[PDB]
């Protein structure tokens, strides 16, 4: 496999994460940290890491079920490291990784094998280079498909103003989240384009990718507010 393998003491850390998340977030607590872990684990051990479906996570979704400040939401764009960086974001909005499941799998890579039934700590599929349906790729499509169906009022999103394709139509965001924003529920998509450096003046609200999003969003009955930042 061309990607890095499951992060060490994986099942050990996914449990400690669920432990902590339930102290801090007491209006959870009722959660069976093991049954959660058991549900997670069962989605991809025994399954070949290029053949995982959003269904396999159905088990764990049921247990992850949660409730969110639907009007304070900030959707999953690949780039969680660039964004967690603005005190405006962490503070004033709800990243998919302040949810439970989001919390557990943030910064982790994982996959198993199938001719056995044991995690693989050596290598894992690289969504771009190898098959595109690795467990991680699919986990995130799964939990964010939910996130998107849950959003109301103004829903935000953050794009790299460096990527060659600022708005990628195939991205988890482009392909999953965008088409699950309900207009009967969401007033506006406010997008924040993040200039890859000062010096780079340049209204990126202009870039056509962005405009393809303006256009798409509008065929959905949702309004579009674009904004630049650093």
């Amino acid at each position, epitope marked *: 496999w061309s990607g890095p393998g499951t992060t060490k003491r994986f099942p050990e850390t996914v449990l400690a994460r669920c432990v902590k998340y339930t102290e801090i977030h007491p209006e959870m607590r009722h959660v069976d940290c093991q049954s959660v872990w058991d549900a997670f684990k069962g989605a991809f051990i025994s399954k070949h890491p290029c053949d995982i479906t959003e269904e396999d996570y159905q088990p764990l979704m049921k247990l992850g079920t949660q409730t969110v400040p639907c009007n304070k939401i900030l959707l999953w764009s690949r780039i969680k490291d660039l964004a967690h960086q603005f005190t405006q974001v962490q503070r004033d909005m709800f990243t998919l990784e302040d949810t439970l499941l989001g919390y557990l799998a943030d910064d982790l890579t994982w996959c198993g094998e199938f001719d056995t039934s044991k995690i693989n700590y050596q290598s894992c599929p690289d969504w771009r280079k190898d098959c595109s349906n690795n467990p991680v790729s699919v986990f995130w499509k799964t939990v964010s498909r939910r996130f998107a169906e849950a959003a109301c009022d103004v829903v935000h999103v953050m794009l790299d103003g460096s990527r060659s394709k600022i708005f990628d139509k195939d991205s988890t965001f482009g392909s999953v989240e965008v088409h699950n924003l309900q*207009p009967e529920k969401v007033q*506006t998509l406010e997008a924040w384009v993040i200039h890859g450096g000062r010096e780079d003046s340049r209204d990126l609200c202009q870039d056509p990718t962005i405009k393809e999003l303006e256009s798409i969003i509008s065929k959905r009955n949702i309004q579009f507010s674009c904004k630049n930042i650093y």
Partner: antibody, heavy 119, light 106 residues
């Protein structure tokens, strides 16, 4: 400081061309969209049309016949143009900054131009 | 889709707590905006998407309402808050409301 300053006719002969010119300051037409509403004492307020940041336009079912909004971004001004006028085409016509890039609530409105259609 | 503000005129004394109504042919799913027009002047944006306020606009102003029935409200009415009060829906092609004029009780 956002301003939308019209100018044009005011008095216009029946079945002519109405042609107002909205001219915007403290902002740009590639960033926001521009709506036209008119107010006649009889019909209250009515949405005529809209010239997006994009450039595309959407028109009110009724006037899509005789309507033509268009803009000149270099000089930040929008061009209303209505054909075969009439008695009731008498009203004040306003423009407005779309609040946000692409939305309908309009934050900063134009002064309005009272138009009277008569020989 | 049509906007019917009902009440067309109102008078209540200063410091009084006023309220207005808007209702649509059909569910507009919050696509609604309140505008405050003082005659002899262009109309003013007050509230958008049913409840989100706006700069300048005093904290006195209340955006509420849901489904088909929306609502403007001032807490302790002041003086320079007299005008016709209009309502815009934008779930489909924008339509407005009759109007609702305000008069002090002198």
């Amino acid at each position: 400081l956002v301003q939308l300053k019209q100018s044009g006719p005011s008095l216009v002969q029946p079945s002519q061309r109405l042609s107002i010119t909205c001219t915007v300051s403290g902002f740009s037409l590639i960033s926001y969209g521009v709506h036209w509403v008119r107010q006649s004492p009889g019909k209250g307020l009515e949405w005529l049309g809209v010239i997006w940041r994009g450039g595309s336009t959407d028109y009110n079912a009724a006037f899509m016949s005789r309507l033509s909004i268009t803009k000149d971004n270099s000089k930040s001004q929008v061009f209303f143009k209505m054909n075969s006028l009439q008695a009731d085409d008498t009203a004040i016509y306003f423009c407005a900054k779309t609040l946000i890039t692409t939305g309908y609530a309009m934050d900063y409105w134009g002064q309005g131009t009272s138009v009277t259609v008569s020989s | 889709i049509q906007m019917t503000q009902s009440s067309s005129s109102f008078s209540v004394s200063l410091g009084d707590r006023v309220t207005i109504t808007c209702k649509a042919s059909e569910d507009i799913y919050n696509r609604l905006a309140w505008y405050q027009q003082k005659p002899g002047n262009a109309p003013r944006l007050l509230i958008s998407g049913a409840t989100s306020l706006e700069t300048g606009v005093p904290s006195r102003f209340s955006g509420s309402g849901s489904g088909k029935d929306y609502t403007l409200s001032i807490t302790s009415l002041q003086t320079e808050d007299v005008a016709t009060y209009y309502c815009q829906q934008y779930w489909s092609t924008p339509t407005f409301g009759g109007g609702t004029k305000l008069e002090i009780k002198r």
